[PDB]
Structure 1
Amino acid sequence: HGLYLPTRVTAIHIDPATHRQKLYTLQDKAQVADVVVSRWLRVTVAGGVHISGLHTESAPRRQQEQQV
């Protein structure tokens, strides 16, 4: 729980050609890409992007508490 924000990444790959090939249009006019998250392997692969070794650290809440 709490908002975790990225602090490190070990490897990112972007291959625009494979990206344009992976996109498939839905019944509407929208272009979509399927995504899979493997918490065992530490890879987030979607379309033509490949994030590996993401690390997120807890950030303290601003406690601005604008609501009183």
Structure 2
Amino acid sequence: DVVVSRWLRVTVAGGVHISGLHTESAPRRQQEQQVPILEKFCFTPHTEE
């Protein structure tokens, strides 16, 4: 069982006891991100001029 106390900045579970954990934002920038194919569903007459 785990308990997190943001007020005391302590996380306790089992036989472990973490205090004063500090986390810093990562850039979160990943290369080669997915590139979706964008299209429009449009009517099209068979014959045009």
TM-score category (smaller protein) = 0.5 to 0.7
* Counterpart check, 1:67 vs 2:34: yes
User: Structure 1 runs of 4+ off > 2 angstroms?
Assistant: none
Structure with a larger share of its residues in strand: 1
| SS of residue paired to 1:45 | strand
Gaps of 5+ in 2: 36-49
- Give the number of the structure with larger relative contact order, counting CA–CA contacts within 8 Å between residues 6 or more apart: 1
Q: How large is the RMSD of aligned CA atoms in angstroms?
A: 1.1
| SS of residue paired to 1:44 | strand
Structure with a larger share of its residues in helix: 1
What percent of counterpart residues are identical? 100
| SS of residue paired to 2:29 | coil
Gaps of 5+ in 1: 1-33
**How many residues in Structure 1 have an aligned counterpart in Structure 2?**
35
User: Which of 13, 19, 22 lines up with 1:52 in the alignment?
Assistant: 19
